């Protein structure tokens, strides 16, 4: 379901999605369509990209349009999981005082 590799992957993909929309000053939906349009048809890469949008696109849009970073997205969508007592794994600067409140808000968005 969720391990350290799916967490890295999600953070990478969401990071590219977020940064593409910023670079091209576009919507998140258009950034995900841009990314897939760049990927070849070969090896099912383009099709697989569009299928990820079909499954996760709408949740990614809602969270990224609320200005939550890739860390919050991937934890909210359960690609990353902080187990009881274990440290919090994150790639971007993380304010610990408000992390749980941010995660609480993120869950409400995709609820």
């Amino acid at each position: 379901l969720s391990n350290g590799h799916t967490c890295v992957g999600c953070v990478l993909v969401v990071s590219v999605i977020e940064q593409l929309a910023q670079v091209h000053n576009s919507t998140v939906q258009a950034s995900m369509e841009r990314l897939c349009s760049y990927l070849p048809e070969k090896l099912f890469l383009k099709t697989t990209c569009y299928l990820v949008i079909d499954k996760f696109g709408s949740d990614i849009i809602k969270l990224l349009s609320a200005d939550m970073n890739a860390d919050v997205v991937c934890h909210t969508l359960e690609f990353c999981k902080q187990n009881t007592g274990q440290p919090l794994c994150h790639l971007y600067p993380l304010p610990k005082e408000t992390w749980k409140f941010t995660l609480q808000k993120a869950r409400q968005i995709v609820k």
């Binding site: 967490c7 590219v16 919090l88």
Partner: protein, 420 residues
Amino acid sequence: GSDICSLPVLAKICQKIKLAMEQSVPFKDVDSDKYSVFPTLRGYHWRGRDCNDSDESVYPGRRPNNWDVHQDSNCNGIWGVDPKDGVPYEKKFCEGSQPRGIILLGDAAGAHFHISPEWITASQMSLNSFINLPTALTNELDWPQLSGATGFLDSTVGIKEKSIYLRLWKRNHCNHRDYQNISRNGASSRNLKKFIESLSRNKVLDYPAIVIYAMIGNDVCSGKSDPVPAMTTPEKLYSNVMQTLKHLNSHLPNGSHVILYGLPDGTFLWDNLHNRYHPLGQLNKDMTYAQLYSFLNCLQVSPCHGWMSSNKTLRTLTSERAEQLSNTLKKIAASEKFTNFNLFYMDFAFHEIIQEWQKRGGQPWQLIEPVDGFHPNEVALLLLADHFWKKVQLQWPQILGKENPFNPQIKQVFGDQGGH
């Protein structure tokens, strides 16, 4: 129930692909001599292109079959007979030149593991960014066709240095296509036994080979929280290497050479990168390699916790063990004797590479793969090959053989010798 691999026709294709990857042999290999006409899936990007995929007795590195009168039996492009005097071209141009192949027994660095920053850097991303992605995936994200040992394509970077293979072909053009990159991303002294058999060399029917043993990280690199107990001990490395060398002795023709590469002092990674921004952090200057290392270690998925760590104590312990494992390799080469090959040792010596790179106006951080922040990139691998060549020239000229006087004639009669 969904998977194609249980379909009528695709089931056997599926199993053939998986078996090929399990064994690290070409998927496209009709005569099953481990040389391919297809580039990826362990194909000719990894070894010499098979000039006749319907003849198991024809492949790079083989001794000529009756001087290649009717067929180019070793895919070096030299065959036929000179009508001027009826002498076989391979006899007059290659006999007495002592041809030899280059074989790399290596890891992710030897296979040139490279995730392109173009794939993940939004500022420059375009349609052109991912044209190379299908090739890289079917090559296990390795780029052996550009590696420092067995590279044969034109380099992306702007430095003139060539791979060991192309320097060996240049010295003696009869060595055309006689390369093999027998490397896996996670290869170590412990697991080399699992694909050593993928090596192709017949003790009696093929030319001798230069073999570079370059397990230069995985024995001290790990993703575990406490990576120290997982590192190979000097006792176990010696035992692992001796099994490998014993295996090579019964496969390599006499006149072969085995060169053991020491492990690096990876402390230069943190020192040169921890302050710099990762490709993903270059748009908004909000992620450094320090932040990346910590992320990967929290997840326990780092390719090398020991060296990719803010924990200087751990970085010091890793280099210490790497120093001991290198000294163990030094003692094997100095004292162990085998009938069919001579042994040599060479320090990794990345500090010498940095100095050379600094002579040319470069900085250390430009020698590391930007995405993973660990492996040496194309520049570093070619500089390591240059350092390799010059050292062997200086210390052991016999390994590289002699310059073939007939190289100009080979070029004139055969030109590109069939390409790669």
